[PDB]
Design a protein around this ligand. Structure first.
Ligand SMILES: Cc1cc2nc3c(=O)[nH]c(=O)nc-3n(C[C@H](O)[C@H](O)[C@H](O)COP(=O)(O)OP(=O)(O)OC[C@H]3O[C@@H](n4cnc5c(N)ncnc54)[C@H](O)[C@@H]3O)c2cc1C
Ligand SMILES: Cc1cc2nc3c(=O)[nH]c(=O)nc-3n(C[C@H](O)[C@H](O)[C@H](O)COP(=O)(O)OP(=O)(O)OC[C@H]3O[C@@H](n4cnc5c(N)ncnc54)[C@H](O)[C@@H]3O)c2cc1C
Ligand SMILES: NC(=O)C1=CN([C@@H]2O[C@H](COP(=O)(O)OP(=O)(O)OC[C@H]3O[C@@H](n4cnc5c(N)ncnc54)[C@H](OP(=O)(O)O)[C@@H]3O)[C@@H](O)[C@H]2O)C=CC1
Ligand SMILES: NC(=O)C1=CN([C@@H]2O[C@H](COP(=O)(O)OP(=O)(O)OC[C@H]3O[C@@H](n4cnc5c(N)ncnc54)[C@H](OP(=O)(O)O)[C@@H]3O)[C@@H](O)[C@H]2O)C=CC1
Ligand code: HEB
Ligand code: HEB
Ligand code: HEB
Ligand code: HEB
Ligand SMILES: CCCCCCCCCCCC(=O)OC[C@H](COP(=O)([O-])O)OC(=O)CCCCCCCCCCC
Ligand SMILES: CCCCCCCCCCCC(=O)OC[C@H](COP(=O)([O-])O)OC(=O)CCCCCCCCCCC
Ligand SMILES: [Zn+2]
Lengths: 13, 619, 619, 13
């Protein structure tokens, strides 16, 4: 959900 | 112990009945844990064998839970939610998200695996021990606190009884309805005029500096005002029903009665719009405008009360003197909010660029104004950043109401907003920095000035550590005409770290920054009592916060190991505390308190027994 | 040149007439120098030969004077008195005694001999060059200074014209003597009531901090009060003669007239006792008691002026509010005068033991009280000691009046007297210590706050010089959150060092203490202009003071050689001064002024031309 | 006079 996108962005960052 | 009792209860329930519903009924639960447990076990033999592996090894229990939830960020979060006995003090959801992201990241590119997650968990120094491992009014202290507020209410009600009685006595001739009306009128004269004075926030900042704040409450003024407002709205209604019953009895011109209808309607407007529902909804300008009619209620009433103009004159001159003494740029500064961090448990952290010639002492508050939130509202907030910090000004704004909630919830949906602060106000705290072995005690939520005070203490104490540039023989100089303390305790007693997770992280930061230096001497000792966590097993949400802060500043557990043993549950034992403060010899102890008056007297007793010099700082 | 003119005049007088009286007549003098000269010469040949040896070698002239006075402390003092052209600025008699004792002591056990006195004099670095060697209203600046005082007097006189006219107009019916009496009465109503307010020295300390002191004079209050007193004593006399002429015209009971006789007598008592002769004589309690009758004049007048109680009410409530707000230990401290040094030119130096929690900013005054002098008089004095000095508090109390003269002359006939100071009052001077290349300019006698400011600047500037204890690599650290200045000028312009010999010695001390460091950078530059000494030949009394101070702290002339060339005679040349300040690049110049407003505008012009940030500090 | 006593005291000191 919202936190999954957060983890994806953190891994991409 | 709990595992054995659970096993006994399961064995007793098993002998009393296995279907999935029966298993849930025996467990007295809907449970994602129960269904997966059944799906992995699929009889009394199967249940006992599964329980024995589950009972008779914490890491094994965590692996069991992992396989249960295994059907990878959102899932690990549920694992940690399952592994927390959220009982009295809790881990805020922001800190939980941070913890789960920290585990998942260092463990792994996609989903994590429990095997390497095990050694990743063991790598965390404090996450293991703090994660619980399992499957599933009348007191003399009360009146001692509230005696000042009770005396203020009693003086108010006694003055009202005096005025009502003196008016109804003189007007005893007129019969049975001019007595009531005359009593209510003589009350309204004072009620309006002095409902003004409660809003001299240019004088409350002056009375609050003095010792008068210790005797009469200066923080209840807004809600003594909301009380005089209600008594006015009741007494004017009784006044009106008295003067209409009187005219009805006269049934069986002048400018006094129609102005009466006008005043009744204006007061019902100031009373309908001033409710909570008007500022709870984001109408902070509508409340301000409809209240701006207190002028028209004050105008009509001069043409109403033949003697009212004297009442309105003394506090009215005071009030407009103040509202004029404050103008556009009196002490304002249209500073820019540099950054806004939303700390956990709904607290907003504002970094507002410091005005060049903005000099404050530690523990000085300021009236904040943010036109995006509310255009004309000025709320006060303590500066929680030491003056030695030159760039910005911190404010930790906990959501305790409708404006502060608006500030938070406005920033959460989203940082250069327009801010007009109003100067530093505050009692001088030079009694602290000129002392030796100060014992800063603080209780409740009035500790935001202790944040500034401890940060300034530590800045000034590290400023007296000189390092030679040539031979690097770093020595410690003596007093520097600003600071004299040889030791500083700090004891923070509070029911729980509800909105003060930033403060727990601040105490952790101070202990980290002066535990690398504590081999030869420890300057600051930061205690913490929680008074609602019955046993140290309950204070496992703070251990998690400290083990999480040890990973932003990569350090060893020995940095906090001082603070871990001073982070105690339940109330203090003041005998042992003061006796240990006495065991050390670093000067003459000077206790400083910031909290309720019942605890203030308890501490004053213990202090004058032991021979320390008690204080009560009022910031 | 003067020697040649003297020789020519002697030759012309000789040819015009030698007896002793004729020689004195030719010299146009009684002269101990003339009689001994005759006695050592005993004709035109003798006079010319003696003059040639006396004309055609300064040390020879001094030996000549020595043999003249030779007929040894008191005699050398007369020699030095003969060797000083005391013209515009002078050497105070205390400094003269010190100089003569310093010469006589180092020269010799009894009387000294001129031969060794010669080399003793040559040993003094600056005594030779400074001892002269010989045998024998309407300006726009004025109104610019006094425009504020003139506007205050004009507002006062205009309000009086208004009240007199409005009263004599309404009472135009009553004939020719109730007009005068009614006008004077309507004036007295205001005169008494507001002659009160001038004595709110608890509010003047607050108005003086603000910028209002720049626009209206707050230091004339005592002598605006002595002016309202005289106008009251005139108007009440006219009121009384009007009401007795009126009763005389009525010739051709009530409590209004006998209270009138009582008020006339009470006012003549408050006017006879308040003269200068009552405090000039050491009656400082008699003046205070007879003035304490302003209560009875204020009492009788309530029973006199039917409308007077409103006038007396507003300023009277103010005045008694203040006199009550100040009680026994409001901010007082019964400190002990540690030592009292009587500096030259009748200035008293008080070292008063600092109260423990007495924190002041540099430039803060205090109200001093000494019951031995005057039991109820509180005079204000600037603290002339930097706050960094922790032991004592200095006050340099120049004899400008009757209390200060009493203090001096009482200590001179004679040191643990009883002293009750009253707190620090003063404008904040943090604008200075947060600056770069400040240019402190001061003019006139309002420089006692610059003593404290320069001492504090130097304390803080030497505090940022660290010396490694191990390898002694002494370095200079940067700013220390208290001070930022890279350079500090100070320009002191005054007509002469009349009572400020302590200040000249202070500037000499600061230059001594930071000329041992100037080899690589000079932090403070201390200028001094004298504006009454027409030529540098006249500023030889200051050279003597500096050469005398170089022998209390044994140093080389190169310590002062910086200050000797910045100790100039006559007014400044602001073009060159500001242009040199500009030639240096040490930051952004921030001129700070403390002096008259005509010079303030001159400096503001030059400053905004050159691009500095002018200020006007009001301390 | 006064200064003679001063010189005497200074020599004695
Ligand atoms: C010196 C001082 C420092 C403070 N510092 C902080 C701080 O750092 N962080 C923080 O979260 N809170 C702080 N407060 C308390 C409070 O949260 C804010 O001052 C202010 O209440 C915010 O308004 P609100 O809309 O949240 O209150 P509201 O929702 O309008 O009212 C709820 C409560 O706040 C009180 N209140 C309302 N308006 C004001 C006002 N203008 N001034 C004072 N109390 C008011 C009411 O009496 C009531 O108790 C401080 C209070 C004081 C006196
Ligand atoms: C902030 C401030 C600091 C001062 N610091 C010094 C200082 O360090 N040294 C010094 O010698 N003088 C100082 N003075 C001025 C003055 O010498 C003393 O303040 C005070 O005048 C001493 O009383 P007096 O008996 O000498 O005056 P008086 O002989 O009684 O009066 C003569 C003059 O002093 C004025 N004066 C009289 N009484 C007072 C009073 N209570 N307050 C103010 N002025 C008064 C009169 O207006 C008149 O101009 C200062 C003045 C102020 C306002
Ligand atoms: N000027 C005034 O009139 C002031 C009034 N107040 C009043 O203070 C009242 C109380 O607020 P609050 O601060 O919440 O109440 P407390 O002061 O009781 O709570 C403060 C902390 O002190 C702890 N504590 C209380 N008694 C003891 C004890 N004997 N030994 C050790 N620890 C103790 C409490 O723990 P536990 O949870 O076990 O109590 C709590 O954690 C407020 O209602 C307010 O009106 C506040 C400030 C000044
Ligand atoms: N708030 C107010 O209303 C204030 C009023 N005053 C008024 O100030 C008046 C003057 O007092 P005083 O300070 O004696 O007068 P000045 O300020 O004239 O004397 C101060 C020094 O400035 C020197 N000076 C004056 N003009 C110049 C110039 N153009 N260039 C260089 N140097 C100059 C003077 O030297 P010279 O001897 O050549 O003039 C004197 O040495 C007082 O009468 C007082 O009333 C004082 C302070 C504030
Ligand atoms: C604010 C509120 C209020 C209100 C609402 C009101 C409302 C009213 N009101 Fe009032 N009042 C008042 C407040 C008031 N009020 C007062 C304060 C007074 C005064 C009293 C006395 O002072 O005595 C009066 C007074 C009054 C009187 C008396 C008269 C005179 O002047 O003396 C009358 C009659 C009345 C009526 C009335 C009416 C009818 C009404 C309704 C409509 N009133
Ligand atoms: C008439 C008279 C009056 C009355 C009746 C009233 C009534 C009232 N009120 Fe008031 N207020 C007032 C007058 C008043 N008032 C004033 C004056 C003020 C102030 C404002 C300003 O400051 O401006 C107030 C203010 C106020 C406030 C504040 C705001 C902020 O926050 O800041 C509040 C909350 C209130 C409430 C109220 C209430 C609830 C009531 C009941 C109805 N208020
Ligand atoms: C302080 C000073 C003073 C003085 C000294 C005086 C002195 C006098 N005085 Fe004198 N007054 C006065 C101040 C005065 N005063 C006044 C302020 C008045 C008021 C006026 C009016 O207000 O109109 C009078 C007033 C008065 C009067 C009027 C009445 C009434 O009540 O109305 C009379 C008659 C008098 C007389 C008199 C006399 C006879 C005398 C002398 C003996 N007146
Ligand atoms: C009635 C009213 C009055 C009057 C008429 C007066 C009048 C007078 N005056 Fe007087 N004063 C006064 C009221 C007065 N006064 C007062 C209130 C005071 C204050 C004191 C105290 O603070 O306590 C004085 C104070 C005073 C002083 C101050 C002291 C010191 O130094 O500190 C003086 C100097 C005076 C002077 C005077 C004179 C010269 C006169 C003229 C006669 N004066
Ligand atoms: C600068 C001036 C300072 C003035 C200081 C005023 C101090 C007294 C203020 C009293 C305000 C008050 O009662 O508090 C609101 C309470 C909740 O208080 P708390 O328990 O949260 O502290 O909420 C309530 O429960 C209110 C109940 C009070 C009812 C009182 C009725 C009185 C009727 C009088 C009629 C004549
Ligand atoms: C906090 C309140 C602040 C009030 C500020 C008051 C400012 C005005 C005060 C005026 C006092 C005064 O005149 O000074 C005394 C003068 C000598 O002054 P100076 O030249 O030494 O500055 O000595 C004199 O020569 C006095 C002559 C003045 C004569 C004026 C006559 C006015 C007559 C009015 C009749 C209605
Ligand atoms: Zn070194």
């Amino acid at each position: 959900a919202a936190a999954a996108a957060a983890a994806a962005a953190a891994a991409a960052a | 112990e709990e595992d054995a009792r659970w096993l006994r209860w399961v064995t007793q329930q098993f002998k009393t009945i296995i279907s999935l519903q029966e298993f849930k009924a025996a467990l007295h639960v809907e449970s994602f844990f129960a269904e997966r447990f059944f799906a992995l076990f699929d009889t009394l033999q199967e249940l006992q064998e599964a329980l024995t592996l589950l009972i008779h090894s914490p890491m094994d229990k965590l692996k069991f839970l992992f396989q249960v939830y295994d059907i990878d960020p959102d899932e690990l979060r549920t694992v940690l939610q399952s592994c927390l006995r959220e009982s009295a003090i809790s881990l805020p959801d922001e800190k939980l998200d941070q913890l789960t992201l920290a585990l998942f990241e260092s463990a792994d590119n996609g989903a994590i695996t429990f095997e390497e997650l095990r050694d990743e968990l063991q790598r965390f120094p404090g996450v293991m021990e703090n994660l619980t491992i399992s499957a599933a009014q009348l007191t003399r202290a009360y009146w001692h606190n509230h005696r000042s507020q009770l005396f203020c209410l009693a003086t108010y009600a006694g003055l009202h009884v005096l005025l009502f009685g003196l008016a109804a006595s003189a007007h005893r001739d007129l019969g049975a309805s001019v007595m009531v009306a005359k009593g209510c009128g003589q009350c309204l004269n004072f009620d309006c005029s002095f409902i003004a004075v409660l809003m001299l926030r240019r004088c409350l900042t002056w009375l609050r500096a003095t010792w008068l704040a210790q005797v009469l409450p200066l923080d209840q003024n807004i809600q003594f005002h909301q009380l005089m407002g209600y008594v006015v709205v009741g007494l004017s209604l009784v006044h009106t029903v008295a003067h209409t019953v009187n005219f009805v009895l006269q049934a069986q011109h002048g400018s006094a009665s129609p102005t009466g209808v006008a005043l009744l309607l204006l007061l019902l407007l100031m009373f309908i719009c001033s409710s909570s529902c008007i500022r709870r909804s984001g109408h902070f300008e509508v409340f301000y405008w409809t209240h701006l009619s207190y002028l028209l209620v004050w105008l009509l009433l001069i043409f109403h009360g033949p003697n009212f103009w004297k009442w309105l004159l003394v506090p009215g001159i005071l009030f407009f003197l103040e509202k004029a003494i404050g103008l556009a740029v009196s002490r304002m500064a249209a500073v820019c909010i540099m950054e806004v961090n939303l700390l956990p448990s709904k607290v907003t952290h504002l970094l507002i660029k410091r005005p060049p010639f903005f000099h404050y002492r530690p523990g000085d508050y300021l009236y904040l104004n943010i036109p995006t939130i509310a255009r004309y509202e000025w709320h006060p907030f303590t500066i929680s950043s030491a003056p030695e910090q030159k760039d910005t000004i911190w404010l930790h704004i906990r959501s305790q109401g409708q404006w502060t909630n608006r500030l938070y919830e406005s920033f959460k949906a989203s940082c250069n907003i327009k801010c007009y602060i109003d100067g530093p106000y505050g009692t001088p705290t030079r009694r602290i920095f000129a002392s030796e072995h100060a014992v800063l005690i603080g209780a409740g939520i009035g500790i935001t000035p202790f944040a500034s005070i401890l940060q300034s203490i530590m800045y000034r104490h590290q400023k007296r550590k000189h390092t030679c540039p040539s031979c690097q023989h770093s020595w410690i100089e003596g007093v520097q005409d600003n600071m004299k303390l040889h030791k500083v305790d700090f004891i923070w007693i509070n029911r729980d770290q509800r909105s003060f997770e930033w403060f727990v992280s601040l105490l952790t930061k101070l202990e980290m920054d002066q535990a690398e230096e504590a081999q030869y001497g420890r300057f600051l000792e930061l205690h913490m009592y929680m008074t609602s966590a019955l046993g140290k097993n309950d204070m496992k949400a703070i251990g998690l916060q400290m083990a999480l802060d040890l990973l932003a500043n990569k350090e060893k557990k020995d940095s906090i190991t001082g603070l871990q043993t001073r982070t105690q549950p339940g109330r203090p034992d003041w005998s042992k505390v003061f006796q240990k403060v006495a065991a050390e010899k670093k000067g003459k102890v000077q206790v400083f308190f910031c909290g309720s008056p019942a605890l203030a007297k308890v501490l004053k007793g213990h202090c004058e027994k032991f021979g320390f010099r008690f204080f009560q700082e009022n910031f």
